[PDB]
Write a protein that binds this ligand. Structure first.
Ligand SMILES: [Fe+3]
Length: 403
């Protein structure tokens, strides 16, 4: 079996695009070579070495992927939240510094080393849940130096821990205080300085925008995308979360990897996404914490065949929950997804959302060897039972990482 590492007797939920549901197969032997799945052979065709690990029929799935997080940040909005729960009017909270700006001030003030130290434990929670690839965004700096410093912390995390990290420049998350009366000059700084400096330093894998009434207009959004294109950077966007400005269609035209939130996505946007092969990313935890009532158009997205990814949206003000599995559970409960859709949402579709559809998310020969051996019987459990370590083996790039 011409490869150096082999797992015997694994029951694979391949999650192959061409196989129904979970793509579950009879017991197999999984061999890896040079960080890639080198062979998948039915145990019945075999009858070890000795360093060949026998999983004794335990379930194996591709590593989990959560394609939309803001897990890098400093400060705490817990007290602000408490003031709100107590009845203190939002206006009062705001004038004293509450809101996203609060996170921005804390993050700007925090040193690169501090942000790294603050992010370590957050990533560790995802790791033990089975997350092998995580996407992390900037957007809490709102200055060239602070945006790039966040991207660097993200790069550091990937080097320091056994996990793949995709970085996303999200400088247009909000208009910084210094540009309050000049929203349009902030856009130019992004296009002519921040994106360029980020690209030159190889710090951004993609560019993202918060297209919203309390964010950036469709026009301002188009500006960024144009700049990202010039430096050969992939794009994506935060859209239709609170309102529909037509951002989803625009993103689709630019060949956006994906569009996130989608609470207010319309029929035309859906057609666009389906045609351009854009991934629709559902962020149920944010929907929950914000007590939103307008549900994303899941039914229409399904009818149109638009793949839906599921992610945690870990962030200080909107989704303070560091768990991808909780998000899967909420996608099912709040959005009506099936456990199988949720699973595909954190593997196959999440991979595509990050432009890694050819390298991750499925147990196919030739793709990266990122998989997990669980102690639970069926993959449906991954969306059901939450908060319990259940990994027996976590392999990234062909290597055991659990120890
Ligand atoms: Fe987000």
């Amino acid at each position: 079996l011409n490869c150096e590492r082999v797992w015997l007797n694994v029951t694979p939920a391949t999650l192959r695009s061409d196989l129904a549901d979970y793509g579950l197969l009879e017991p197999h032997a999984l061999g890896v070579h040079e960080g890639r799945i080198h062979a998948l052979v039915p145990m019945q065709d075999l009858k070890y070495p000795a360093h060949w690990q026998d999983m004794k029929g335990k379930l194996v799935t591709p590593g989990l992927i959560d394609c939309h997080t803001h897990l890098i940040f400093a400060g705490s909005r817990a007290e602000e939240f408490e003031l709100r729960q107590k009845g203190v009017p939002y206006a009062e909270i705001a004038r004293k510094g509450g809101g996203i700006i609060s996170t921005v001030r804390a993050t700007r003030a925090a040193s690169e080393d501090q942000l790294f130290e603050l992010a370590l434990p957050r990533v560790k929670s995802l790791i033990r849940e089975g997350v092998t690839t995580v996407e992390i965004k900037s957007g809490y700096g709102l200055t060239l130096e602070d945006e790039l410093k966040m991207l660097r912390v993200a790069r550091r995390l990937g080097e320091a821990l056994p996990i793949r990290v995709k970085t996303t420049l999200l400088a247009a998350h909000a208009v910084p205080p210094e540009y309050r009366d000049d929203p349009d000059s902030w856009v130019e700084t992004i296009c002519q300085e921040i994106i360029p400096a980020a690209a030159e330093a190889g710090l951004a894998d993609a560019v993202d925008v918060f297209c919203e009434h309390i964010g950036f207009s469709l026009a301002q959004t188009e500006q960024v995308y144009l700049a990202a294109d010039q430096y050969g950077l992939a794009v994506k966007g935060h859209m239709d979360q609170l309102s529909n400005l037509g951002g989803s269609t625009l993103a689709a035209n630019f060949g956006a990897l994906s569009v996130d939130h989608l609470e207010y996505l319309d029929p035309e946007g859906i057609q666009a996404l389906a045609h351009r092969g854009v991934v629709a990313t559902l962020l149920p935890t944010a929907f929950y914490f914000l007590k939103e009532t307008k549900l994303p158009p899941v039914v229409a997205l399904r009818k149109a065949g638009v793949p839906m990814a599921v992610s945690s949206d870990i962030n200080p003000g909107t989704a303070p929950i560091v768990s991808l599995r909780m998000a899967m559970n909420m996608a099912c409960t709040l959005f009506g997804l099936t456990p199988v859709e949720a699973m595909a949402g954190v593997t196959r579709h999440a991979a595509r959302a990050l432009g890694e559809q050819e390298q991750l998310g499925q147990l196919r020969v030739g793709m990266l060897a990122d998989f997990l051996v669980w102690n639970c019987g069926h993959p449906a459990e991954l969306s059901y039972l939450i908060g319990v370590d259940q990994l027996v083996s976590r392999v990234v790039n062909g290597e055991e990482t659990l120890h």
